[PDB]
Amino acid sequence: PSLRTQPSLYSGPFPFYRRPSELGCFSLDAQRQYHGDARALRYYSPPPINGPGPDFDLRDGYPDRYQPRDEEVQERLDHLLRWVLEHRNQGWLAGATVTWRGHLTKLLTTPYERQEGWQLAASRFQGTLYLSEVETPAARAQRLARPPLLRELMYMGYKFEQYMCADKPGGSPDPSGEVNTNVAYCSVLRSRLGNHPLLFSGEVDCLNPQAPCTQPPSCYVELKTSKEMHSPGQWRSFYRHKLLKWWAQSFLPGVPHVVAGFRNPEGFVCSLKTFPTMEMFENVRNDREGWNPSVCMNFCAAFLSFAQSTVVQDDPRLVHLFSWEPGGPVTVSVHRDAPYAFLPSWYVETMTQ
Numbered sequence: 103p104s105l106r107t108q109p110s111l112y113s114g115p116f117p118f119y120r121r122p123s124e125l126g127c128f129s130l131d132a133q134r135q136y137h138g139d140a141r142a143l144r145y146y147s148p149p150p151i152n153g154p155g156p157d158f159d160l161r162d163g164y165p166d167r168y169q170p171r172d173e174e175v176q177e178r179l180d181h182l183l184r185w186v187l188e189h190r191n192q193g194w195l196a197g198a199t200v201t202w203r204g205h206l207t208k209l210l211t212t213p214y215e216r217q218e219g220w221q222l223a224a225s226r227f228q229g230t231l232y233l234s235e236v237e238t239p240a241a242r243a244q245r246l247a248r249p250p251l252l253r254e255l256m257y258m259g260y261k262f263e264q265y266m267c268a269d270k271p272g273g274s275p276d277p278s279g280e281v282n283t284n285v286a287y288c289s290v291l292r293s294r295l296g297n298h299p300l301l302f303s304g305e306v307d308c309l310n311p312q313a314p315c316t317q318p319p320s321c322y323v324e325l326k327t328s329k330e331m332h333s334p335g336q337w338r339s340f341y342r343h344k345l346l347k348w349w350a351q352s353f354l355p356g357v358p359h360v361v362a363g364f365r366n367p368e369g370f371v372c373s374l375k376t377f378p379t380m381e382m383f384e385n386v387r388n389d390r391e392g393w394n395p396s397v398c399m400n401f402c403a404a405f406l407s408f409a410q411s412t413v414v415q416d417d418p419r420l421v422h423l424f425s426w427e428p429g430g431p432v433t434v435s436v437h438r439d440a441p442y443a444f445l446p447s448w449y450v451e452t453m454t455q
């Protein structure tokens with residue numbers, strides 16, 4: 103059938119969500135090449151009490167010292183599949199759903215999302231269900247038309263991370279190097295939502311070498327950017343929409359610590375604010391127009407359930423395309439081979455042996 107999306111259908115007790123465990127990780131380098139190590143992981147290095155508070159020029163180095171990752175390249179699940187292949191002997195996988203954390207984020211935010219539609223392609227292969235986002239025609243059009251100032255704004259986000267990160271534990275941030283968005287660190291995580299086992303990985307911003315719990319993902323820190331705010335209305339508006347995204351993104355991998363840099367009209371970060379992941383909901387708890395963690399999760403569970411029961415055939419060439427648009431239900435279409443098939447032959451053959 104189709105799956106309804108509205109929040110009042112998914113109120114009720116917070117579902118079972120197993121505390122995420124890191125099964126491993128991988129890194130992408132300056133030219134988007136996979137390495138099965140943590141080389142790209144950077145280390146949390148906030149401004150000390152000793153010296154000045156933050157005064158970070160997010161415009162510095164734009165565009166000369168900016169090497170943006172090529173966005174035309176469809177990567178699908180490839181990097182994760184490689185990790186999965188290199189670790190096949192860790193039958194749990196057969197019952198798992200496999201994705202990127204980001205895809206799960208969009209499921210979590212669906213009941214409250216007013217603008218951004220999405221498309222998830224789904225193939226079952228050896229029991230395992232694989233989900234992989236397809237960029238909607240609308241979203242592609244917006245990406246190809248990205249205005250100069252929106253391109254700079256993306257840079258500034260990654261630039262903020264450079265002021266807050268050191269290459270080594272207890273090191274100093276070097277805000278004069280290149281920002282290269284091909285370079286990423288990813289944690290590979292195991293969880294279970296309800297009775298749906300999960301294998302997913304997400305981009306991790308940095309490690310806090312001063313977190314008393316030295317074990318991932320507890321020791322990770324997410325670094326965020328947003329417009330400076332003044333009126334209560336701007337804060338309320340931030341809590342209701344943006345905070346929801348931040349919560350979903352870091353809750354899934356079990357990242358407890360989020361730091362926000364608020365940027366000037368002149369493009370400087372003159373204040374920081376820490377949002378512990380577990381505290382984010384307190385900002386909207388009494389808000390009649392707020393979001394609810396268990397609405398996000400109950401919908402997400404219902405979607406997984408829906409996808410599991412819909413995708414019956416075990417076939418790597420077969421795709422059930424799940425589509426969603428704000429103010430509508432999740433609908434399904436069936437497709438075979440190109441252009442929607444996403445599991446590469448090199449993976450299918452090798453997992454078959």
Ligand SMILES: Nc1nc2c(ncn2[C@@H]2O[C@H](COP(=O)(O)OP(=O)(O)O)[C@@H](O)[C@H]2O)c(=O)[nH]1
Nearest residue numbers: 173177202203204205207286288303304305351
């Ligand atoms: N090309 C491309 N890669 C992405 C994008 N978003 C995430 N990735 C990559 O996909 C992997 C998982 O990302 P994920 O955690 O799901 O993204 P996020 O939660 O939206 O920040 C990482 O290796 C990222 O570098 C994107 O919009 N374009």
Ligand SMILES: [Mg+2]
Nearest residue numbers: 307324325326
């Ligand atoms: Mg971030």
